[PDB]
Amino acid sequence: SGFRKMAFPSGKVEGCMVQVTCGTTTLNGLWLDDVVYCPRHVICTSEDMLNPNYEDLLIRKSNHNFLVQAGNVQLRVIGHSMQNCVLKLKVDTANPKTPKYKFVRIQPGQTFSVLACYNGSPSGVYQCAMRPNFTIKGSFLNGSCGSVGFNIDYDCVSFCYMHHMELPTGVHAGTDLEGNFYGPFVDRQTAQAAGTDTTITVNVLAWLYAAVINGDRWFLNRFTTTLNDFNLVAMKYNYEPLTQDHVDILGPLSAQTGIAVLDMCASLKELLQNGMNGRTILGSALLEDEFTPFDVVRQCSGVT
Amino acid sequence: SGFRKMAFPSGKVEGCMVQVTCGTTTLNGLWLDDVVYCPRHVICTSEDMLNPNYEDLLIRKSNHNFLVQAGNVQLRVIGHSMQNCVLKLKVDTANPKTPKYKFVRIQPGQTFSVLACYNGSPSGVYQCAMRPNFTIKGSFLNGSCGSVGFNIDYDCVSFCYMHHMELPTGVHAGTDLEGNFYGPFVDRQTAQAAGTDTTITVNVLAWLYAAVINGDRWFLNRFTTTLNDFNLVAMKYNYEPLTQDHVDILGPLSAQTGIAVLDMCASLKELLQNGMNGRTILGSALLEDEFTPFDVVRQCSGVT
Numbered sequence: 320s321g322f323r324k325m326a327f328p329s330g331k332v333e334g335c336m337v338q339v340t341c342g343t344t345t346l347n348g349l350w351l352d353d354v355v356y357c358p359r360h361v362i363c364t365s366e367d368m369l370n371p372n373y374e375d376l377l378i379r380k381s382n383h384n385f386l387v388q389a390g391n392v393q394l395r396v397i398g399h400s401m402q403n404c405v406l407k408l409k410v411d412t413a414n415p416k417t418p419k420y421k422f423v424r425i426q427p428g429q430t431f432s433v434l435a436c437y438n439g440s441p442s443g444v445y446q447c448a449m450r451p452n453f454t455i456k457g458s459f460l461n462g463s464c465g466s467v468g469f470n471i472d473y474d475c476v477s478f479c480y481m482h483h484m485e486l487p488t489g490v491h492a493g494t495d496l497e498g499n500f501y502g503p504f505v506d507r508q509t510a511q512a513a514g515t516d517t518t519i520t521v522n523v524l525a526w527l528y529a530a531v532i533n534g535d536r537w538f539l540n541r542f543t544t545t546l547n548d549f550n551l552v553a554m555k556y557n558y559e560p561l562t563q564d565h566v567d568i569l570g571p572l573s574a575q576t577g578i579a580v581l582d583m584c585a586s587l588k589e590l591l592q593n594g595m596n597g598r599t600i601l602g603s604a605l606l607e608d609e610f611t612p613f614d615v616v617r618q619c620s621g622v623t
Numbered sequence: 624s625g626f627r628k629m630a631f632p633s634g635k636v637e638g639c640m641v642q643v644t645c646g647t648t649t650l651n652g653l654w655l656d657d658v659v660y661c662p663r664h665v666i667c668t669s670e671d672m673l674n675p676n677y678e679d680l681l682i683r684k685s686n687h688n689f690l691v692q693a694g695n696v697q698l699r700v701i702g703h704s705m706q707n708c709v710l711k712l713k714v715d716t717a718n719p720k721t722p723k724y725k726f727v728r729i730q731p732g733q734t735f736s737v738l739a740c741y742n743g744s745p746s747g748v749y750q751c752a753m754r755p756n757f758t759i760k761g762s763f764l765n766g767s768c769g770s771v772g773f774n775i776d777y778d779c780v781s782f783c784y785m786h787h788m789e790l791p792t793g794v795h796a797g798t799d800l801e802g803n804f805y806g807p808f809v810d811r812q813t814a815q816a817a818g819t820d821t822t823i824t825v826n827v828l829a830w831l832y833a834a835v836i837n838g839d840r841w842f843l844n845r846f847t848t849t850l851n852d853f854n855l856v857a858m859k860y861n862y863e864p865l866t867q868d869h870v871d872i873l874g875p876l877s878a879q880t881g882i883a884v885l886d887m888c889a890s891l892k893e894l895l896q897n898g899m900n901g902r903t904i905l906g907s908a909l910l911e912d913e914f915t916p917f918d919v920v921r922q923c924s925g926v927t
């Protein structure tokens with residue numbers, strides 16, 4: 320028992336991290352097979368960041384200008400290309416530590432582990448969610464760019480995120496591994512609206528099921544609700560509307576606990592309307608939304 | 624910016640995990656050099672767990688009874704010994720993936736990362752604190768025994784914990800790598816008092832400094848206090864008494880923010896007496912105590 324914000328073991332990803340330097344800028348790169356992936360803003364200077372012309376900046380760069388170092392060994396760059404907001408540096412050596420991997424674009428509300436890196440070296444690993452508004456509330460300092468997000472299914476790493484920037488609001492924005500930003504964000508040092516964020520309702524419900532499985536049951540009540548009634552409450556409290564697809568995904572947790580999804584919705588409704596009254600759930604004094612139903616079952620069943 | 628419950632990158636530890644089977648019990652082992660470390664209760668059956676005579680049980684076991692498997696390769700056991708509550712299985716092959724390492728006994732209030740494992744395979748990594756009462760609030764299911772806790776200083780892994788059991792209260796107990804339990808716990812299936820837990824005051828203050836560094840400043844007030852006055856409040860709210868050693872460790876954070884430690888104590892005093900009033904700090908609605916001053920500086924400065 321117990322419930323933690325658990326990240327995937329980062330080993331397979333640590334072995335892929337490299338340092339990429341271009342001019343005076345150093346950031347992290349991802350070495351898979353004979354390609355190093357990194358944010359394209361590695362080619363910018365501070366004058367550029369305000370409105371960079373990436374095509375023009377990249378034209379002044381040659382393969383020898385991209386310094387790629389894996390630990391202490393230098394990689395030889397034999398090609399460079401820009402795909403959306405990422406640079407793909409073709410190197411002459413395939414990473415011997417390349418795990419089985421996929422590049423996937425996650426959906427808002429889904430979770431992933433982030434391996435924060437500086438100068439190509441891993442510093443820590445944490446679990447987070449892609450917010451409904453396509454930002455992540457990460458922990459990243461200067462030099463963290465190129466750190467990646469991923470999920471692991473047995474031996475396969477599915478990379479879903481590459482870190483590009485911190486917005487003026489202190490939240491984080493980045494791309495999938497094809498360099499497409501999640502959300503409306505551009506790789507430019509400008510004010511950028513993230514838009515209204517909402518709480519990931521299906522994840523709060525999955526977390527309430529985790530709480531029941533782990534013994535925290537105080538919030539269970541004698542009530543039920545309907546999807547329409549619950550969604551009226553969800554709207555008022557900036558929660559994502561619950562759909563039958565969300566109910567269906569919560570199926571296994573409803574079966575495990577014997578608590579019908581709409582009954583758990585009624586518990587959530589009462590918690591939204593009345594708060595926690597100074598009580599806690601799984602060590603938290605707020606409603607947690609960064610655990611998907613998949614995460615709850617995984618952590619509650621011990622998938623390795 | 625941003626502040627997360629960040630664990631150390633688990634790669635160096637993943638490469639040490641093995642599966643140990645004895646009779647019909649399977650748990651995790653730690654392979655460092657030519658030794659595999661695992662909880663000694665791997666030799667027990669369900670009748671035994673109520674009051675096991677470990678010396679007697681181990682005498683019926685031979686080297687060939689301990690099945691040690693690293694991934695899919697079998698390790699040859701050439702020696703076995705019990706040290707306190709751990710078994711040391713001497714194997715004929717040194718782990719090629721053994722990182723630089725130390726065995727350290729952590730102090731209550733200190734933090735560490737846990738690599739939860741099942742059948743010798745890593746499932747997740749999370750950060751936690753050794754509670755003042757020597758329990759850990761982990762996330763562990765059947766088969767997690769032998770999962771370890773550690774800290775990493777550049778290339779050296781300091782192992783501090785090995786998981787042995789879940790108490791009837793749902794909290795976790797285990798040993799240092801010499802097999803000495805943290806706390807009064809015994810490796811027996813009996814009711815065991817954990818004793819009064821308290822909040823780790825120096826960690827809450829370090830976390831309040833992290834909040835100031837990251838922009839969450841609403842809780843800063845016009846007041847100050849003394850160590851004696853603050854400790855009267857700490858006692859009432861089951862907080863550990865603050866000492867000058869704790870003030871000295873908070874020195875760097877006080878210097879970084881320009882907020883005197885006793886002034887931060889006064890903020891903490893007002894938060895203890897008045898609660899959060901429905902507000903949050905670093906995304907939390909309660910006072911967080913599982914970040915040490917060292918952790919806060921590390922995460923806020925990007926140590927790899």
Ligand SMILES: COc1ccccc1OCCNC(=O)c1cc(=O)[nH]c2cccc(F)c12
Pocket residue numbers: 360368459460461462463464483484485491505506507508509624
């Ligand atoms: C506004 O900056 C950019 C805009 C567009 C594209 C790239 C931009 O940044 C490039 C470099 N950025 C970092 O290294 C960075 C990342 C981060 O998540 N947090 C930070 C906190 C403090 C200081 C920092 F430099 C960072």
Ligand SMILES: COc1ccccc1OCCNC(=O)c1cc(=O)[nH]c2cccc(F)c12
Pocket residue numbers: 320664672763764765766767768787788789795809810811812813
């Ligand atoms: C009371 O059990 C013991 C007592 C003394 C010594 C060893 C004991 O357990 C041996 C096996 N234990 C586990 O595999 C275990 C560990 C854990 O942290 N959580 C669990 C949750 C559910 C079911 C479980 F078996 C566990």
